[PDB]
From a paper:
The camelid single domain antibody, referred to VHH or Nanobody, is considered a versatile tool for various biotechnological and clinical applications because of its favorable biophysical properties. To be employed in human therapy, VHHs from camelid origin should be subjected to humanization processes to minimize their potential immunogenicity, similarly to other conventional antibodies employed in therapeutics.
The results showed a dramatic decrease in the melting temperature (T m) of 7D12‐Vob (52.2°C) compared with both, wild‐type 7D12 (63.6°C) and Vobarilizumab (70.9°C). Interestingly, whereas framework‐2 is covered by the long CDR3 in wild‐type 7D12, as shown in a previous study, 25 framework‐2 in the chimeric antibody was exposed due to the extended conformation of its CDR3. On the other hand, only Tyr42 among these three positions (42, 50, and 52) was involved in contacts with the CDR3 in the crystal structures of 7D12‐Vob and Vobarilizumab, and with lower values (BSA values were 22.9 Å2 and 9.6 Å2, respectively). Although small conformational changes of CDR loops in antibody humanization have been observed in previous research, 17 , 19 the conformational change of the CDR3 loop in 7D12‐Vob was drastic, shifting from a bended conformation, as observed in wild‐type 7D12, to an extended conformation in the grafted VHH. This structural change is likely a critical factor decreasing both affinity and thermal stability. Indeed, 7D12‐Vob E1Q‐Y42F‐L52F‐F106A exhibited a similar affinity to wild‐type 7D12 (K D: 4.7 and 4.1 nM respectively), thus recovering the affinity lost upon CDR‐Grafting.
Residue numbers in the entry: 1 to 28, 31 to 126
Write the structure that this text describes.
């Protein structure tokens, strides 16, 4: 089915910007999300988009700073990250969300990218 390759991570000063890319080599899904996981913390959904692209959601903490978009033709998902804060430091993952059966229930069967590290530090 599908391989997701992420790029665009890096080290930036507070207030800096990065653009993450999630290139889907192949095809399979209900939608597409960007997630992030900092050490000791869970994998937070920070931005989500529908197929038609007019349903976008954002975590409260990234509203007005992050923008999710898709290029149909390039099969590529993007996250534009502006006004980055130390607390945005995490590994960022793209996922294509599918469904699968488990003992009478549905669970989210995700196609996961490998992750791209974002570090926001005065050291940058």
């Amino acid at each position: 089915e599908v391989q997701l390759v992420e790029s665009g991570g890096g080290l930036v000063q507070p207030g800096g910007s990065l653009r993450l890319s999630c290139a889907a080599s192949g095809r399979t899904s209900y939608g597409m999300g960007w997630y992030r996981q900092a050490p000791g913390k869970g994998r937070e959904l920070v931005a989500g988009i529908s197929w038609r692209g007019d349903s976008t959601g954002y975590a409260d903490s990234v509203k007005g700073r992050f923008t999710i978009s898709r290029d149909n033709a390039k099969n590529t998902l993007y996250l534009q990250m502006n006004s980055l804060r130390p607390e945005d430091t995490a590994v960022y993952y793209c996922a294509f969300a599918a469904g699968s059966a488990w003992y009478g229930t549905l669970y989210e069967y995700d196609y996961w990218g490998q992750g791209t590290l974002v570090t926001v530090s005065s050291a940058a």
